[PDB]
Amino acid sequence: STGSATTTPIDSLDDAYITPVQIGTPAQTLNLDFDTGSSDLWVFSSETTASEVDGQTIYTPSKSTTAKLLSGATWSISYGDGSSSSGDVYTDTVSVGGLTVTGQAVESAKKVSSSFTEDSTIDGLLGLAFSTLNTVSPTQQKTFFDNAKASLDSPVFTADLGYHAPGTYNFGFIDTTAYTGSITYTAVSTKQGFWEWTSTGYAVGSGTFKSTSIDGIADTGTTLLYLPATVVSAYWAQVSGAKSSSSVGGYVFPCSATLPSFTFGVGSARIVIPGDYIDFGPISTGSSSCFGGIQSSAGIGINIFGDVALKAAFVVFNGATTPTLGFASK
């Protein structure tokens, strides 16, 4: 089997991407944030505190003839930005782009924090990191990908995120028309439950490539690119007027600037992030100070290749017995 679904930026800055997901019988379609940095499939639901729902589409398991309460199971997650949610668990039929999993754990939110309530366009998350990070207790549950794997033509999924445009998540096959050149595969450590890999270096604009190992995670659920302070300083030094602002919480730059590209290494290959991808617009409405798309990971504790980086590539998440990651230009 295979599946293929279109993923769409939620706003004009590509802050996140939503992908339609069918849950239950009859289908209830929710627009989920596919997140390769987490491993819970959780949704706004009929059980969510009313005051904490603000425009989202909800999953109502009582209306699904295939939903079953997973007795005694709860979940609770806190992401790396202060946001949180928690609730109970059902199993139900979940389909993504024609690919169906029966018995998928669907985590129903009883509580969500303001940060999630405020994103009216995101009806929940579909985690695609390793199932070892799944928060369901007392019996940890598998991700949609983990559940689908055995049935897929090939045990892979791919992320093809667009810049200010729709893109595609495919399951079970590699669309050889979706990228240019070849796919360079690189080793993954699953020891922290992430798609954790090591970049071979970077370049800023037309600058010379610096060979240096940068460990990080491929995370579709993070907007920006978080890299070591040395790397980030080297980048923003090439932008006249750029500075790190403690009040704003990162590097800002004059909105009148044209940004240089940023290149990261994948083995001997190179992925180029165009400068425009690194512009996240005014810090506040009407401001001429703009927020940078490359930020320091210092104090996060991990480097994160988020959407800024991933949308410059066709990315293969290979869940073979020994998982690997593949990157191609596009």
Curated annotation (Swiss-Prot):
Disulfide bonds join 255-290. This is Endothiapepsin. It catalyses: Hydrolysis of proteins with specificity similar to that of pepsin A, prefers hydrophobic residues at P1 and P1', but does not cleave 14-Ala-|-Leu-15 in the B chain of insulin or Z-Glu-Tyr. Clots milk. It comes from Cryphonectria parasitica. Its EC number is 3.4.23.22. The keyword Transit peptide does not apply. One of its GO terms (biological process) is proteolysis. Belongs to the peptidase A1 family. GO terms for molecular function: aspartic-type endopeptidase activity. Keywords: Aspartyl protease, Disulfide bond, Hydrolase, Protease, Signal, Zymogen. It is an enzyme of class 3 (hydrolase). Residues 17-328 form the Peptidase A1 domain. The active site is at residues 35, 199. The gene is EAPA.
